[PDB]
Design a binder for this molecule. Structure first.
Ligand code: 6PG
Ligand code: 6PG
Lengths: 466, 467
């Protein structure tokens, strides 16, 4: 008479999640304010246990208590509009689940407001794309821990499974913790794609490699430690030829699009005081990407060196490979330092090892790399920074020679390497016992009387320099 | 019996500004809610036309109308609290001037709310420090234009005077444009200091020079095109001694303090879609400087190359100079691109040439470099980007060779150069006709079906990439 879970908003992401839930033996109610999308789902659901509803009242009354309602509607005001309409129809203990690409600060607000109406609110990050939602995504749910455990069985059944069987879902933390770490996953994803793009730019501009050799190189890289979904599809992309047997990717306009999640991570890092240089450079790299016609006009006015390489290209290709793997470690080390601080500031008590665990499959950044981050936190739960992990430390201690060679060669040949440059600069600053920040403190004391501390004496000092 | 202008908040900044005003022949009323500071300044103003008040009602009733009130109260709630209590006592046409380090969005809110009660509001950036506030600071007032004109004489009197005879103050724009431009100034200031810090880092760790040679180099640089207040005081700083013959700068804790305007500029750039890489790296550089204990522990676990240099040090030191000057050009170009975008979105109608004009003196980033920015916009008011100005373009055309050599050398010797690196990366990215964002777009279409556009034909496309 009543279904076990309900899904509002039946675009392709909501349709696929509901179908995923139904494929595991659960009964699902579906509703869409525009009932035409409900009418096509039912025809695409011949045989499936999908119960359509054509009103919020009928939808809510269709669900067993405590009601489990998954919100898969457009982010922003539509989500708040759907919440406000449901609130009069719900009963105490009902559970709302926002699976959209929501800013975590809105989730904090909705969770706080709804809780005063005795209503549970789970903001859940969902990663994996359209195909990921239909077969097994990465799921980052945050909110009331008790309400999570009441829906954990459903989430665990639909989530992607790692090679050790563990489902790629776990309780992240209170209120907005889930949507927060989904935002950080996307920020990490930005840097992964930009580092691949810089490897690609070096192979094309500096080495003059054809699209076939570019694809084969990424495939060879994918058979080793760099194995990842993004590197896999990068190999497939350079295989996709077009009308006249040319690389289709070479005819795509170089203007990188964006939703909020990219700039949101960088803004949050700045607010928290975390040096998220690599991801931020990637976000900034998308900004420069978008002013195409301005760059086209600047290319005719500003000259640079002509890229040339007189050495062994296969040896240098391997240096790019080392540079890519080391830059991932530096980028992830920054992203996990941000989550550690956000956990502390928001009192989320995050378990960073669990985040790497649920990112091993389902999500876009999924890679064997994620298993070694989990190994890092499994070996040392108090690990203060990824660079200090014994395995990762041994890598960057080795690969730094190739990363320096790759950056310096890119700079002398006019090939921009913002992600590579940021990684090596992060490694050199983080390991530096003494930075030139003492001169910054001396200047601020000069013109602003901002005082300073000393390296030998303890206390606060001010100096009349002139 | 009445005064011409009033100052609320008598810490050092509000004090010196009140004394600056009084030094020009104006009558100033002063107030501070904690009367401790008020009693002290009346002792410090023996013989000066300073009328002290000891209640908000007495303060307002002591000023001639339209009343001109300079608020120098702690930013945030204390400033909004002062406005809320002043409002019932004011009359239509009165003018409030907030001169603290205020987030421009707060100024937008206050201005529009107070406009509904016929109260003018001016958010004025103040740059120059305590001494600069006493003699002549840079002033960036934003608000109602006819409210600025009724106080323009006072501001022009107290502002620093460039050697054109022009004062370092202009009507910046409506509402929060004054505090916005002040915020970008501080963001630019962060980068100027980080670039100087990197230049110094290359001298100590790579070239092995000591404080004597480092100081004389910055003075040598300050005689040429790089002449700036910041580079000048750097040379002075590397000469202050421990009284045990040591350079005092070397035993200062390398944990850079920071306040809002630094990260505010980067956060704003990220909201506007502006590539502010150099200022942002400098903000991030201060963050990583703060975890000193985390760094000293990493210093014993993460090794790197032993910095060694064998070539001609004087040629390379000159290369560092060219690297510093070109990095400023890219950094300022990013900052002035941000301001151009911000005025477009806020209809502020900013005149960037006037900004560089009033930063020629009084402010912290003041330098002959800012005459060239003024000369750029005077040469081309529709300048797309400072890098396209013929003078700057010729500089970066030649200096890019040096900046590459410095960045490559520092990278090979483990000396971090985040400002130098992001500047040459900005140059190579801004001038790149074709960037590798085509691959990023292809990937976003692969896993997200976000679709893409093409270079040859036109329209929007989505592709089945794998079979
Ligand atoms: O599926 C995921 O892992 C992420 O959620 C990501 O795929 C996001 O949802 C968009 O697809 C890309 O976002 P941008 O437009 O910011 O690249
Ligand atoms: O006069 C100026 O230009 C500034 O107002 C200055 O006095 C301010 O104190 C710092 O430049 C801000 O930088 P911090 O955030 O490092 O203080």
């Amino acid at each position: 008479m009543t279904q076990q879970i309900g899904v509002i908003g039946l675009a392709v992401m909501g349709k696929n999640l509901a179908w995923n839930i139904e494929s595991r033996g659960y009964s699902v109610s579906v509703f869409n304010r525009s009932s035409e999308k409900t009418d096509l789902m039912v025809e695409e659901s011949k045989g499936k246990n999908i119960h359509p509803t054509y009103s919020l009242e009928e939808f809510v009354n269709s669900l067993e208590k405590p009601r489990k309602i998954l919100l898969m509607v457009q982010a922003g005001k539509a989500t708040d509009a759907t919440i406000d309409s449901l609130l009069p129809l719900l009963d105490d203990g009902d559970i709302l689940i926002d699976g959209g690409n929501t800013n975590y600060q809105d989730t904090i607000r909705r969770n706080k407001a709804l809780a005063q109406s005795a209503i549970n609110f789970i903001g859940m990050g969902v990663s994996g794309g359209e195909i990921g939602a239909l077969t097994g995504p990465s799921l980052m749910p945050g909110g009331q821990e008790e309400a999570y455990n009441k829906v954990a069985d459903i989430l665990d059944a639909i989530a992607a499974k790692a090679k050790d069987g563990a489902s790629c879902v776990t309780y992240i933390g209170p209120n907005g913790a889930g949507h927060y770490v989904k935002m950080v996953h996307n920020g990490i994803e930005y840097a992964d794609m930009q580092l691949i793009a810089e490897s690609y730019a070096m192979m094309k501009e500096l080495l003059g490699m054809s699209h076939e050799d570019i694809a084969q190189t990424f495939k060879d890289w994918n058979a080793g430690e760099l194995e990842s979904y993004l590197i896999e599809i990068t190999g497939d992309i350079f295989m996709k030829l077009d009308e006249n047997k040319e690389a289709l990717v070479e005819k795509i306009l170089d203007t990188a699009g964006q939703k909020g999640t990219g700039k949101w991570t960088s803004i949050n890092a700045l607010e928290l005081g975390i040096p998220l240089t690599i991801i931020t450079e990637s976000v900034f790299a998308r900004f420069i990407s978008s002013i195409k016609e301005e760059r086209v006009n600047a290319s005719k006015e500003l000259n640079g060196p002509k890229a040339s390489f007189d050495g062994d290209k296969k040896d240098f290709l391997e240096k790019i490979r080392k540079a890519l793997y080391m830059s991932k470690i530096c980028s992830y080390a920054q992203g996990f330092a941000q989550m550690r601080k956000a956990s502390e500031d928001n009192e989320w008590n995050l378990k960073l090892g669990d985040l790497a665990m649920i990112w091993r499959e389902g999500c876009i950044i999924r890679a064997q790399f994620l298993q070694k981050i989990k190994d890092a936190y499994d070996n040392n739960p108090g690990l203060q920074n990824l660079l200090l992990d014994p395995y990762f430390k041994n890598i960057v201690t080795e690969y730094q020679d190739a990363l320096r060679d790759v950056v310096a060669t890119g700079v002398q040949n006019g090939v921009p390497t913002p992600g590579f440059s940021s990684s090596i600069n992060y490694y050199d600053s983080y390991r530096a016992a003494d930075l030139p920040a003492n001169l910054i403190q001396a200047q601020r004391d000069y013109f602003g009387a901002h005082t300073y501390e000393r390296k030998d004496k303890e206390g606060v000092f001010h100096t009349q320099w002139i």
